[PDB]
Symmetry: C2
Subunit: 222 residues, 2 copies
């Protein structure tokens, strides 16, 4: 067992350059991370660099990080990403529509991504917990289940807050065993990741994955 | 009237329908240049301001990170225009610019311009807070060659906003042929006037009501 297989090696900064993407993918091969998460402009490069690393998936983000574009654009960006080599996509919900109880639009928005990814990529639904009430977190997860998503995910990392154990337990309670639960945003050390795992997370989104795995190895050394 | 140069902007991820209604009625009251809303709200803003052709509907493209593909930016532009947008603000591929990949930066801008061709103004956000002085110059030059209509300082989601020296640099590059928009950090009339005196022809802000109410 190793925590690295549950970590999405993420780098989504707007000023990210090619040399940083190359290093991220090489780190993913060395540590056997679950995936690399990069912005859609880097999907083609990540897929080429990891073409012989089948256990390391290419993940990208859709309608990210604001989630306030139309369902038609989110589906097009999903299909475009899959053509470029993405096998996982993390979409952001329409938070405003969720605030307005426009549940049919929130679900159709998620379903547009799911339909474009059908049979080709996992879809993770970022509900952006730092912006939701307790009832909205539950409603968003229920819409993700009804839409056929594979994962519910806490945070973009670009909002006010990140993953909390209480949110993860809430999300795991709604989706049960049928969908994965991803803790992202603010997961900085092994203590953070293990707390999310205990709360019910099955995938960790982080940028410090190397420091997290090295902390795991240090528990075995003198 | 400085109101005619202000883009009444509200791009928060948790923005709700009642806030867009308040945004549009404020713009139709003060005759702002435009409202700037995320693409999900374009169709609503276009109908709320159908009887105010002087107030355009502006939306944002590949916003705010600029790190999606040119084909997606073009689709989002075409989709935004179909929904009622007549001005689009796109974010450059910053990583491509920092990597000297000038053909991709220009092709990326070019994709939005061709989608908007004859239907909408294109504003190119160069995100000055992440750019060296030379990259700021190169970004404007690539905007001119691709056929954009404006150069814009900031997305409103970075660590820095418009500065007078940045506005003057961009104005010197594009001259009179393209507009210069100061966005991010402008909160009063004194800031707005400082950007305009530096060469800006459009102001992006959220406190446009407080700015115009200080024109006494």
């Amino acid at each position: 067992r190793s925590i690295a297989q549950m970590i999405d090696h993420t780098l989504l900064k707007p000023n990210t350059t090619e040399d940083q993407i190359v290093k991220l993918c090489e780190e993913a091969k060395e540590y056997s991370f679950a995936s690399v998460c990069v912005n859609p402009t880097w999907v083609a490069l990540a897929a080429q660099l990891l073409k012989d690393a089948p256990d390391v998936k290419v993940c990208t983000v859709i309608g990210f990080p604001l989630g306030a574009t139309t369902p038609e654009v989110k589906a097009f960006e999903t299909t475009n990403a899959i053509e470029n080599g993405a096998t996982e996509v993390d979409m952001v919900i329409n938070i405003g529509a969720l605030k307005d109880k426009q549940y049919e639009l929130v679900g159709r928005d998620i379903q547009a991504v799911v339909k474009a990814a059908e049979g080709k990529a996992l879809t993770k639904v970022i509900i952006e917990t730092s912006l939701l009430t307790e009832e909205e977190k539950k409603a968003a997860c229920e819409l993700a289940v009804k839409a056929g998503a594979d994962f519910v995910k806490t945070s973009t990392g670009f909002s006010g807050g990140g993953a909390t154990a209480e949110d993860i337990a809430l999300m795991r309670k709604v989706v049960g065993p049928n969908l994965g639960v991803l803790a992202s945003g603010g997961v900085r050390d092994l203590s953070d990741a293990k707390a999310m795992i205990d709360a019910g997370a099955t995938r960790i989104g982080a940028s410090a994955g190397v420091a997290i795995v090295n902390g795991e190895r240090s528990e075995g050394s003198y």
